[PDB]
PDB file of C-alpha atoms and ligand atoms in Angstrom:
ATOM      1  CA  UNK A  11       7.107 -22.401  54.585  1.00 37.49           C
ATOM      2  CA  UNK A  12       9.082 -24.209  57.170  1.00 36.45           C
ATOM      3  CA  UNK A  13       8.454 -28.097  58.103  1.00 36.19           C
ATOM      4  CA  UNK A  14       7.228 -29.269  60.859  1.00 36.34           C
ATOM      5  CA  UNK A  15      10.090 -31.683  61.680  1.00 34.04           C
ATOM      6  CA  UNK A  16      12.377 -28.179  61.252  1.00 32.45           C
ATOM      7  CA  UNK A  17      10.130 -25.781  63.243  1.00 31.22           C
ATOM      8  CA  UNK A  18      10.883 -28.501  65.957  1.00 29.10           C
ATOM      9  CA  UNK A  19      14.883 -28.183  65.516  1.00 29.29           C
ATOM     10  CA  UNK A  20      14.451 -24.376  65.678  1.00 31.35           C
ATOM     11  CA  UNK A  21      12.705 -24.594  68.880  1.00 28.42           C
ATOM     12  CA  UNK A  22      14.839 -27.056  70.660  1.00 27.66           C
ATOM     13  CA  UNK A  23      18.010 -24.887  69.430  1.00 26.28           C
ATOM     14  CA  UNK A  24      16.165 -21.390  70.150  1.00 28.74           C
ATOM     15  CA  UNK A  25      15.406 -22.796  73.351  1.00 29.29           C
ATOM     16  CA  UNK A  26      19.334 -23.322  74.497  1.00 29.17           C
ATOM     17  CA  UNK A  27      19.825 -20.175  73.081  1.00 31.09           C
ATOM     18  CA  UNK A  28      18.261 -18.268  75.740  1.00 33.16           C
ATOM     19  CA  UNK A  29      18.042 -21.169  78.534  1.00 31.30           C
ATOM     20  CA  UNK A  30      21.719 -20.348  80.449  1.00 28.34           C
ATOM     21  CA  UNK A  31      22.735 -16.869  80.330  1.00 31.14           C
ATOM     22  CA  UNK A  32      25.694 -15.062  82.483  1.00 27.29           C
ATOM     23  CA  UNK A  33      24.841 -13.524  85.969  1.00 27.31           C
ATOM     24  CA  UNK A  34      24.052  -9.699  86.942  1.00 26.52           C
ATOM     25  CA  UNK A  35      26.565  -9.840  89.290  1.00 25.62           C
ATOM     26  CA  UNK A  36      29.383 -10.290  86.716  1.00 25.11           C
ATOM     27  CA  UNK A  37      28.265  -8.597  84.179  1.00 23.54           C
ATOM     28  CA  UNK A  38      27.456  -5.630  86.100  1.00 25.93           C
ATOM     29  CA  UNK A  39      30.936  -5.158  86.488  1.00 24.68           C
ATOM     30  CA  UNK A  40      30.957  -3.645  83.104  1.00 23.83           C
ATOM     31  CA  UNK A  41      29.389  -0.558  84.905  1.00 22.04           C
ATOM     32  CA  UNK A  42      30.568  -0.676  88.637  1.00 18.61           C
ATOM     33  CA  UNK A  43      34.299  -1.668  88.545  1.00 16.98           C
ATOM     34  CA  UNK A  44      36.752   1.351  87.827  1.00 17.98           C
ATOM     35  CA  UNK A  45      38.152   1.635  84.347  1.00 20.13           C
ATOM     36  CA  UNK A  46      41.668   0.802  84.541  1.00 18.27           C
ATOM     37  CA  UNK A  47      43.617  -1.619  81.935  1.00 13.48           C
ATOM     38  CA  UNK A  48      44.335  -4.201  84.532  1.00 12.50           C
ATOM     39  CA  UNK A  49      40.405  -4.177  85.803  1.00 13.91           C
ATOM     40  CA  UNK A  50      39.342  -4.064  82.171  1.00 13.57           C
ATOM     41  CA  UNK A  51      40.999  -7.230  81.412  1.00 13.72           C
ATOM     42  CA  UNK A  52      40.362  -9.215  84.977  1.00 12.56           C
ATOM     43  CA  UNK A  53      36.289  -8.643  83.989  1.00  9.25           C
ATOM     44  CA  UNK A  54      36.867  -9.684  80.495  1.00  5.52           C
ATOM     45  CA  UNK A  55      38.711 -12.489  81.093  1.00  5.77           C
ATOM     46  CA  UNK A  56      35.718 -13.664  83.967  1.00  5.62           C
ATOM     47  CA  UNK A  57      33.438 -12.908  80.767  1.00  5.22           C
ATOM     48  CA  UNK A  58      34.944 -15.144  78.620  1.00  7.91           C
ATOM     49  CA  UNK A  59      35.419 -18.000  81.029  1.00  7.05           C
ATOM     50  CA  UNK A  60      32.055 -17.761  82.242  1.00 10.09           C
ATOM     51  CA  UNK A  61      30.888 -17.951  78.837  1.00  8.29           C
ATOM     52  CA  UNK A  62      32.741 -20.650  77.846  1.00  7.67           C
ATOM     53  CA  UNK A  63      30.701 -22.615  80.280  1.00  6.73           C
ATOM     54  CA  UNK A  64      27.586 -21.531  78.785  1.00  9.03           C
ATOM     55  CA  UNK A  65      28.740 -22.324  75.112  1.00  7.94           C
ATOM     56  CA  UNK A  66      29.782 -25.704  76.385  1.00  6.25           C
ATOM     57  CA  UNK A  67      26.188 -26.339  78.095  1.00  3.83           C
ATOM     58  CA  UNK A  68      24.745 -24.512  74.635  1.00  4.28           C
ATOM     59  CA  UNK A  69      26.212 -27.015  72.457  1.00  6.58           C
ATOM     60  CA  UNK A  70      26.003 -30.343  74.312  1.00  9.13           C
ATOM     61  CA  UNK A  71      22.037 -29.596  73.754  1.00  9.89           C
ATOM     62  CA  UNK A  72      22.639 -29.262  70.004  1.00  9.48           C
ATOM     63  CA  UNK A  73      21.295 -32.413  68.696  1.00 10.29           C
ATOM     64  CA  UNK A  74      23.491 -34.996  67.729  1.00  7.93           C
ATOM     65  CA  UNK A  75      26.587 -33.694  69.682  1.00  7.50           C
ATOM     66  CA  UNK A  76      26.720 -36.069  71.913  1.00  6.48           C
ATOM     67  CA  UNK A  77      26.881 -39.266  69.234  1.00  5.60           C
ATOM     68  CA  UNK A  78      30.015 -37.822  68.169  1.00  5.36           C
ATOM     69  CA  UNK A  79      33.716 -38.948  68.983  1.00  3.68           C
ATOM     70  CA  UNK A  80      34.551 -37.750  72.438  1.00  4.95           C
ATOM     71  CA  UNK A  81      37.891 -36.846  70.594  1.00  7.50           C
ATOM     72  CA  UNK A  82      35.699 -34.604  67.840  1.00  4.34           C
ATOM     73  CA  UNK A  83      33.734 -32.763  70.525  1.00  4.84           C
ATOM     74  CA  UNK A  84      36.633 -30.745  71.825  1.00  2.47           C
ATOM     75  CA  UNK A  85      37.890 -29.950  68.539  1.00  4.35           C
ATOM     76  CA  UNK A  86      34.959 -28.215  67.708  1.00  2.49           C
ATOM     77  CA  UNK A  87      34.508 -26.742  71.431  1.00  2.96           C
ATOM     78  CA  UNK A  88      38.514 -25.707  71.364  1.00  4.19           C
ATOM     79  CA  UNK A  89      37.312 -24.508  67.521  1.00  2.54           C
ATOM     80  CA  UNK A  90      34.525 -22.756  67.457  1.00  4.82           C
ATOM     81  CA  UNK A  91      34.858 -20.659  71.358  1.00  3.27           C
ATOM     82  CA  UNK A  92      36.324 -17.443  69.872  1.00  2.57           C
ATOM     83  CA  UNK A  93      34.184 -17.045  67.069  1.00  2.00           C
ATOM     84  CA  UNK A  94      31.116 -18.143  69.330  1.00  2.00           C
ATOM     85  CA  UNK A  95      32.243 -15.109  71.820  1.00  2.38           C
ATOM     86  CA  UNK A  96      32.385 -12.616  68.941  1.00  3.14           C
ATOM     87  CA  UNK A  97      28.985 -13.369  68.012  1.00  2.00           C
ATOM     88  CA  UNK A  98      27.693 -13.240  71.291  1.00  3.39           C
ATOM     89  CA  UNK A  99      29.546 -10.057  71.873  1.00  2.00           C
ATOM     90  CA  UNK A 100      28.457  -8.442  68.676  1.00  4.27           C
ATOM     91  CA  UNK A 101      25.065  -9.480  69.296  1.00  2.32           C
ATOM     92  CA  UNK A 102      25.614  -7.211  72.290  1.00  3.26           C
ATOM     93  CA  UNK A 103      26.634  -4.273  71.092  1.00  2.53           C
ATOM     94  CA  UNK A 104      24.325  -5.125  67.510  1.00  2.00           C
ATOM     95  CA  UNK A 105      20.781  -5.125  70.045  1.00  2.86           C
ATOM     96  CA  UNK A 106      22.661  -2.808  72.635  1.00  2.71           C
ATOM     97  CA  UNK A 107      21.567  -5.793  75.223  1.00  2.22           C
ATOM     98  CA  UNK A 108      20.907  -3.866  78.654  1.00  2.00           C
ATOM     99  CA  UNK A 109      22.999  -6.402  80.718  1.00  2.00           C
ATOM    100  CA  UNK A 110      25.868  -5.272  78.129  1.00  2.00           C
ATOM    101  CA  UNK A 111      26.302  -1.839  78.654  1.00  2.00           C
ATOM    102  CA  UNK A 112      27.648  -1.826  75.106  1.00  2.00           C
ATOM    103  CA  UNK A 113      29.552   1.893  75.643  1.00  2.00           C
ATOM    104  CA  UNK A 114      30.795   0.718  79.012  1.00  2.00           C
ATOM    105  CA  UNK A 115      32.001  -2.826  77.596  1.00  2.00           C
ATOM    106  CA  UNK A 116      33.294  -1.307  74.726  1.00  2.00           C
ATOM    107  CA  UNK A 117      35.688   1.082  76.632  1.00  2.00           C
ATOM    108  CA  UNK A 118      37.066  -2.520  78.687  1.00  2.00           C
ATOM    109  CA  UNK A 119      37.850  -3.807  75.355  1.00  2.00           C
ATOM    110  CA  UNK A 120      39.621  -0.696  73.310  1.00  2.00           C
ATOM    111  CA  UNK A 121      41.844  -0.864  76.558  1.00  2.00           C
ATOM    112  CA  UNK A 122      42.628  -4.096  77.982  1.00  2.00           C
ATOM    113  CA  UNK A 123      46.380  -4.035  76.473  1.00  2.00           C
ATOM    114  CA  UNK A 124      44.071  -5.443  72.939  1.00  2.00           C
ATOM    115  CA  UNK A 125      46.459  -4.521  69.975  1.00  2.00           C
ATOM    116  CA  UNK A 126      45.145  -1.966  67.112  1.00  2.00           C
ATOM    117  CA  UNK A 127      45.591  -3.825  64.703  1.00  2.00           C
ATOM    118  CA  UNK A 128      43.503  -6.019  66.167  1.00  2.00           C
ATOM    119  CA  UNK A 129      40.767  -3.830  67.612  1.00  2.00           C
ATOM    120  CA  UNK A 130      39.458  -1.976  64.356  1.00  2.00           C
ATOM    121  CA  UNK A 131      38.859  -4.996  62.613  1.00  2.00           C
ATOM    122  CA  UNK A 132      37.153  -6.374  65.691  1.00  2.00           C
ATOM    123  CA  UNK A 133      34.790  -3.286  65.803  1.00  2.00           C
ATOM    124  CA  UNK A 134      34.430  -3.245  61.875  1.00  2.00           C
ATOM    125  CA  UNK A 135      33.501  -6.657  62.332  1.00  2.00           C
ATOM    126  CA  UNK A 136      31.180  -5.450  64.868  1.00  2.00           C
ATOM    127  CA  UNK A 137      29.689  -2.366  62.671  1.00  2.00           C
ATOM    128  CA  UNK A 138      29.472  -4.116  59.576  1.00  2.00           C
ATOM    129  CA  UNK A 139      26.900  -6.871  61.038  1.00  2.00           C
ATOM    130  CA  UNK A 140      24.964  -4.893  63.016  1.00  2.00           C
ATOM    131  CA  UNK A 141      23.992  -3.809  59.905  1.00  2.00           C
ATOM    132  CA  UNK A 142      22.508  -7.118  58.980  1.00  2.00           C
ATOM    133  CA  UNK A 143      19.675  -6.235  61.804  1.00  2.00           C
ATOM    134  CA  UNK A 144      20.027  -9.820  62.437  1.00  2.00           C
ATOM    135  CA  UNK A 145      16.832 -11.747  64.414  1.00  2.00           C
ATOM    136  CA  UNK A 146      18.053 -13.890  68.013  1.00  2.00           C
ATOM    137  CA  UNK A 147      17.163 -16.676  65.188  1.00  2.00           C
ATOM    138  CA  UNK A 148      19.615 -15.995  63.252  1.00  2.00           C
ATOM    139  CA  UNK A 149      22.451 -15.300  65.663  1.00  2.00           C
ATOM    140  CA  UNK A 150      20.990 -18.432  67.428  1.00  2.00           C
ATOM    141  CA  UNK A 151      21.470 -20.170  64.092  1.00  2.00           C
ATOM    142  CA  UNK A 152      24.800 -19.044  62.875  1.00  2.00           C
ATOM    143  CA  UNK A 153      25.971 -19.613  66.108  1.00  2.00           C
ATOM    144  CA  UNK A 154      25.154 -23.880  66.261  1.00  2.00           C
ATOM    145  CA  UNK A 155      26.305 -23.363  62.724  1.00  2.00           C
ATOM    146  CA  UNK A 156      29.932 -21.718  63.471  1.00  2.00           C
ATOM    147  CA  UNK A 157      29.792 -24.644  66.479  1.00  2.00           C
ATOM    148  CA  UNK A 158      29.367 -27.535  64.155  1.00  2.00           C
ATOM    149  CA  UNK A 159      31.871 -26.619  61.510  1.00  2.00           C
ATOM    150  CA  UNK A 160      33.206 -29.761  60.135  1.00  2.00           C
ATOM    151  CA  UNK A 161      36.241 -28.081  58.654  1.00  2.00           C
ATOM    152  CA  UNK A 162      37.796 -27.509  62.104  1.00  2.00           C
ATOM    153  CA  UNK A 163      41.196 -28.872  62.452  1.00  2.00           C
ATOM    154  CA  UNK A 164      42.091 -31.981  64.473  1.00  2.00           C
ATOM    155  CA  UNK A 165      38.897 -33.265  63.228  1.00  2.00           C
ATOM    156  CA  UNK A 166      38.593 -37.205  62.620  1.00  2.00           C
ATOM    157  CA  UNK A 167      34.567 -37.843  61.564  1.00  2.00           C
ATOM    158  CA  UNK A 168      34.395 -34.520  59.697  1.00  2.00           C
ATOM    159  CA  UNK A 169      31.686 -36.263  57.564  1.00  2.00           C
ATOM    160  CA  UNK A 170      29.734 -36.462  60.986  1.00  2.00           C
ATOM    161  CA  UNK A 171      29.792 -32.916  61.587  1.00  2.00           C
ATOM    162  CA  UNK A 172      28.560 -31.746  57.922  1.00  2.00           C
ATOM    163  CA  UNK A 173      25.377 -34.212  58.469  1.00  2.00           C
ATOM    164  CA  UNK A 174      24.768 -32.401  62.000  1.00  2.00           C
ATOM    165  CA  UNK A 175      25.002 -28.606  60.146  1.00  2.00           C
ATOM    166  CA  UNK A 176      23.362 -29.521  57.029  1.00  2.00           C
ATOM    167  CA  UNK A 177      20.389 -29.300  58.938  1.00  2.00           C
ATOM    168  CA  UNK A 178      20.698 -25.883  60.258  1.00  2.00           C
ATOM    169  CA  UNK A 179      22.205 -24.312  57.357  1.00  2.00           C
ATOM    170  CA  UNK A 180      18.668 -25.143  56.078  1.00  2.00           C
ATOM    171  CA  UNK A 181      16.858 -23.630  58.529  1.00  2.00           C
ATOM    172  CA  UNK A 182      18.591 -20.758  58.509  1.00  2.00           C
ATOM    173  CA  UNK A 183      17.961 -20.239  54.410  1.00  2.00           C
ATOM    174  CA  UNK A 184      14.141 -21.507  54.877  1.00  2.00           C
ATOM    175  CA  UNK A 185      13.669 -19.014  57.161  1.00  2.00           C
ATOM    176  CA  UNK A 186      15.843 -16.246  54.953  1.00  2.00           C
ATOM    177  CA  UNK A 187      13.429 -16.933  52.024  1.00  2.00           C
ATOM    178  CA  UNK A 188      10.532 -16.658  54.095  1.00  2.00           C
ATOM    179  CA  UNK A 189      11.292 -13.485  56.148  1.00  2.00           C
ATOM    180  CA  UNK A 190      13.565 -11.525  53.509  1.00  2.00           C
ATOM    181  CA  UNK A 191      11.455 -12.460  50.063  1.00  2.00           C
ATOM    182  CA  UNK A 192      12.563  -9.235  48.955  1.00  2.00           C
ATOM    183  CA  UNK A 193      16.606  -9.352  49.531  1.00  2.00           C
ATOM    184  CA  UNK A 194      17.430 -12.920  48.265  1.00  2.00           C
ATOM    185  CA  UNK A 195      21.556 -12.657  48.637  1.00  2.00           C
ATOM    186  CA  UNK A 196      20.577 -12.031  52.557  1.00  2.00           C
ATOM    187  CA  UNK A 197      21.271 -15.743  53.784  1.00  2.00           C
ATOM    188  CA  UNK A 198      24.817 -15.610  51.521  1.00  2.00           C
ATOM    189  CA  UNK A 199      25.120 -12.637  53.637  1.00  2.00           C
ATOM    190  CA  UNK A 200      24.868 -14.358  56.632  1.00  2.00           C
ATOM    191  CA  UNK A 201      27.450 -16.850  55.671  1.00  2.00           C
ATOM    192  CA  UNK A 202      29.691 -14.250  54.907  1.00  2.00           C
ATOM    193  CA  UNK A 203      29.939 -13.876  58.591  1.00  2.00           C
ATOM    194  CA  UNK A 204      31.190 -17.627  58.843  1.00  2.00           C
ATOM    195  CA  UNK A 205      34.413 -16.541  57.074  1.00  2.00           C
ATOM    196  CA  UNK A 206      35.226 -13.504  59.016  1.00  2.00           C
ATOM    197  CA  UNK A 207      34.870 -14.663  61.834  1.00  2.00           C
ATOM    198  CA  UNK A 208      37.675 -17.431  61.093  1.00  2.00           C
ATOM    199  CA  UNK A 209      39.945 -14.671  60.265  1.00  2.00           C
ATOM    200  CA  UNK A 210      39.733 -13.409  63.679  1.00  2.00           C
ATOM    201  CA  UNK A 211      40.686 -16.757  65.117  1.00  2.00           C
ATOM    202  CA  UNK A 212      44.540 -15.822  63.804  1.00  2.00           C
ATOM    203  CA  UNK A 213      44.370 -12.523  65.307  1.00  2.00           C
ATOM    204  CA  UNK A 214      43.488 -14.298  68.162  1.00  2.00           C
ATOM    205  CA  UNK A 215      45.930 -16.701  68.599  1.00  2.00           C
ATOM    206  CA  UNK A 216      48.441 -13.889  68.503  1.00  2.00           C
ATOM    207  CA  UNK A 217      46.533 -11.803  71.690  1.00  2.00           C
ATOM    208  CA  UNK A 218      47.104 -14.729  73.864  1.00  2.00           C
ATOM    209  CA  UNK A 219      50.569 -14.730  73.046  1.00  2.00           C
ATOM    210  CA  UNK A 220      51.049 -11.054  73.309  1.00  2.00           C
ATOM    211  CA  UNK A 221      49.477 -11.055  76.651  1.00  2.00           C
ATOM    212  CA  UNK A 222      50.834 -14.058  77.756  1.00  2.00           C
ATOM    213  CA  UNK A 223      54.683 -12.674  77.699  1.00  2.00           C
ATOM    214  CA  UNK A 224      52.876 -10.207  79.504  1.00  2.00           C
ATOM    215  CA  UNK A 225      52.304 -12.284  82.638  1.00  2.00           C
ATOM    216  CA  UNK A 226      48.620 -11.507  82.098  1.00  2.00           C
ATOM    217  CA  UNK A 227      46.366 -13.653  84.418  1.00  2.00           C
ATOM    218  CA  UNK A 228      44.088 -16.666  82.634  1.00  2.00           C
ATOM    219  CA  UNK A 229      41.885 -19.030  83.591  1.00  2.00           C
ATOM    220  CA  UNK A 230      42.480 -23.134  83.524  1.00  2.00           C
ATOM    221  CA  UNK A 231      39.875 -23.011  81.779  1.00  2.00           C
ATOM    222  CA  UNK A 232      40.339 -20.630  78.717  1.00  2.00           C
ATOM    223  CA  UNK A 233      44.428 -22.009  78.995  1.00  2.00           C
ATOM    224  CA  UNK A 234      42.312 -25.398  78.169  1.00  2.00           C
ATOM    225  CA  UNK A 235      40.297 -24.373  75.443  1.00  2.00           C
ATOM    226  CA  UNK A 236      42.789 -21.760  73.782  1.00  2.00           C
ATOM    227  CA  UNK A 237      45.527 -24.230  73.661  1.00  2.00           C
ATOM    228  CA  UNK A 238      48.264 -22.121  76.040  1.00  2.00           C
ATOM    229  CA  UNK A 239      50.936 -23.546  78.371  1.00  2.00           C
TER     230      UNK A 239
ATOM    231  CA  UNK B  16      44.394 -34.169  78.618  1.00  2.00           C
ATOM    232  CA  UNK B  17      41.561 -31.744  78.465  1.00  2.00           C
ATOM    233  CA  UNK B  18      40.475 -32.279  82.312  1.00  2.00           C
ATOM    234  CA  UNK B  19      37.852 -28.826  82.185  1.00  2.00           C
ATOM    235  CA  UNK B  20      36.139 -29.326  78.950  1.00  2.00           C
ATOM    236  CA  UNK B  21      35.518 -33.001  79.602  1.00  2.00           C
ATOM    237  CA  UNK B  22      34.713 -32.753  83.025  1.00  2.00           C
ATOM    238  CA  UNK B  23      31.699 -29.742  81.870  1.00  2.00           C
ATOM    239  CA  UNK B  24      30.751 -32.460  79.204  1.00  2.00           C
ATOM    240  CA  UNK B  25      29.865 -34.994  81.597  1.00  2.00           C
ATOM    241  CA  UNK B  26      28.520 -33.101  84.381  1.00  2.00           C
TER     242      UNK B  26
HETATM  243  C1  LIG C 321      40.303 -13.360  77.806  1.00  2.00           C
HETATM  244  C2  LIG C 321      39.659 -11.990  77.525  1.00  2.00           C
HETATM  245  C3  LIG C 321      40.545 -10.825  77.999  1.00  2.00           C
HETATM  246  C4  LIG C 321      39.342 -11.894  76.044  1.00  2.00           C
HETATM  247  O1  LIG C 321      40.252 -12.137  75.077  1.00  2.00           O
HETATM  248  N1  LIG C 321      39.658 -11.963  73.855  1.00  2.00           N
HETATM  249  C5  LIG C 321      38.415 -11.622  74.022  1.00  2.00           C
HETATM  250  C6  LIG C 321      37.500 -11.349  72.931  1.00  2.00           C
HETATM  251  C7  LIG C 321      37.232  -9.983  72.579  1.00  2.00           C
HETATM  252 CL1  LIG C 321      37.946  -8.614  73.386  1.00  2.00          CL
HETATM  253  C8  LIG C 321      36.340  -9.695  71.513  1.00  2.00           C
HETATM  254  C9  LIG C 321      35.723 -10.747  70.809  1.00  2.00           C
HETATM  255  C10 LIG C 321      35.989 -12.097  71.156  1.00  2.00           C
HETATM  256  C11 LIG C 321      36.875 -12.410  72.215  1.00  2.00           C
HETATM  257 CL2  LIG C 321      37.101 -14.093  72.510  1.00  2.00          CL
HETATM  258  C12 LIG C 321      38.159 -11.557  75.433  1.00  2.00           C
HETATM  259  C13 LIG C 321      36.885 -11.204  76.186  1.00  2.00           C
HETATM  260  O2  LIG C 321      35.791 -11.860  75.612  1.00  2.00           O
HETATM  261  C14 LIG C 321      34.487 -11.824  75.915  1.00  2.00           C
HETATM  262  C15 LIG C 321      33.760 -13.029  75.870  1.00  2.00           C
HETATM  263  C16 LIG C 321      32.386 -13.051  76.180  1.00  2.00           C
HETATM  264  C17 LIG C 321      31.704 -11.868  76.537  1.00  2.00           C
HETATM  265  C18 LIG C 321      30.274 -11.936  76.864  1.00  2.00           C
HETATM  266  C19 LIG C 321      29.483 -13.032  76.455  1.00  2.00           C
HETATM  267  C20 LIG C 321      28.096 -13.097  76.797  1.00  2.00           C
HETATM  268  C21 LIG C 321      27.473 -12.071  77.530  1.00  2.00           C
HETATM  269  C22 LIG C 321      26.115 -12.043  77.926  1.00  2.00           C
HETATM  270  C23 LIG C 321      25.149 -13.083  77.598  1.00  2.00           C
HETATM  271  O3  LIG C 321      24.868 -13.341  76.465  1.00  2.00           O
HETATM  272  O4  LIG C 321      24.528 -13.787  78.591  1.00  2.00           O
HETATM  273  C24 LIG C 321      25.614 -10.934  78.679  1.00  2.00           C
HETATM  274  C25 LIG C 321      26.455  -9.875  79.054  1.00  2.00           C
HETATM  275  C26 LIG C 321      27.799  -9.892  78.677  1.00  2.00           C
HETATM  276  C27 LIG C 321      28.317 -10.966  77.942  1.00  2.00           C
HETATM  277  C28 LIG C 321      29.671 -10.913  77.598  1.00  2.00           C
HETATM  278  C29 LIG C 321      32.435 -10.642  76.583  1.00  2.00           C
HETATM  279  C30 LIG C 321      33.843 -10.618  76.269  1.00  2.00           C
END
């Protein structure tokens, strides 16, 4: 059974989860706009940046963000964006979201000058948790949780950080031993999740750089966030 | 440094 002084946390956080949310009019591009490799990146790069607003927005509601170090807050914002933006996007294509047009979105991403060894592990990433039939709770969840890691480099108070995800962690396995009695190793699972998704964050790093050489065109804002000159 | 993030922090 959950607490009282949880099912209030759970609220407040499932409440951010689904208050902002990125316009029709961009994300319809997924559809509309031709399917070329330089219009397939352009609308996923306007993804990202949009979403990086909303993740920003997202997180300042978490509770206790804001009594943290100025300095710690954009480690874990610079820290946690990529691995927010996979679950988000694997959520997507996981509850084949309408405004997502999963097939469409997927064809902007297997050829958007993404490398292959980079793109099967993203979509094996992407299979593989699907298959976790994950609840918006739990995405919701993981999601603060990947947000609040304390383990995030250039951290000072990472002491402050465990106290704010201790919480949710909680939460999260409250609600895994309520809702999957049956499968017990479910909320380990969901942890799993935690770990590959930092593995992607190399991978990552080495995009950018790939498509930076390229004279591919960012934003000031993802340049900001991703660290690139 | 970090002009965007900060700025999106306090608005
Ligand atoms: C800079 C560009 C080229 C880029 O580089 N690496 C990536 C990348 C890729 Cl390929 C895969 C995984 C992670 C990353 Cl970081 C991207 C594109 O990354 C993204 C980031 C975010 C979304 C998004 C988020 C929310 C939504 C929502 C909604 O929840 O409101 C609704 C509809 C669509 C939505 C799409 C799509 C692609």
């Amino acid at each position: 059974e959950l607490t009282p002084d949880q099912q209030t946390l759970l609220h407040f956080i499932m409440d951010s989860y689904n208050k902002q949310r990125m316009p029709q009019e961009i994300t319809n591009k997924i559809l509309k706009e031709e399917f070329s490799a330089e219009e397939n990146f352009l609308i996923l790069t306007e993804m990202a940046t949009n979403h990086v607003q909303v993740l920003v927005e997202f997180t300042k509601k978490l509770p206790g963000f804001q009594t943290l170090d100025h300095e710690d807050q954009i480690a874990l914002l610079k820290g946690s964006a990529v691995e927010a933006m996979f679950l988000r996007s694997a959520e997507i294509f996981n509850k084949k979201l309408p405004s997502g047009h999963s097939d469409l979105l997927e064809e902007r991403i297997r050829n958007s000058g993404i490398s292959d060894e980079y793109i099967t592990p993203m979509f094996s990433f992407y299979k593989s948790i699907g298959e976790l039939k994950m609840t918006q709770e739990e995405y919701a969840l993981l999601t603060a949780i990947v947000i609040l890691s304390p383990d995030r480099q250039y951290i000072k108070d990472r002491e402050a950080v465990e106290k704010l995800q201790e919480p949710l962690l909680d939460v999260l396995q409250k609600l895994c031993k309520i809702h999957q009695p049956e499968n017990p190793q479910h909320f380990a699972c969901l942890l799993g999740r935690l770990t590959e998704l930092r593995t992607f964050n190399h991978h990552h790093a080495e995009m950018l750089m790939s498509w930076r050489v390229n004279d591919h065109k960012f934003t000031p804002l993802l340049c900001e966030i991703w660290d690139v000159q | 440094d970090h002009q965007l993030l900060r700025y999106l922090l306090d608005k």
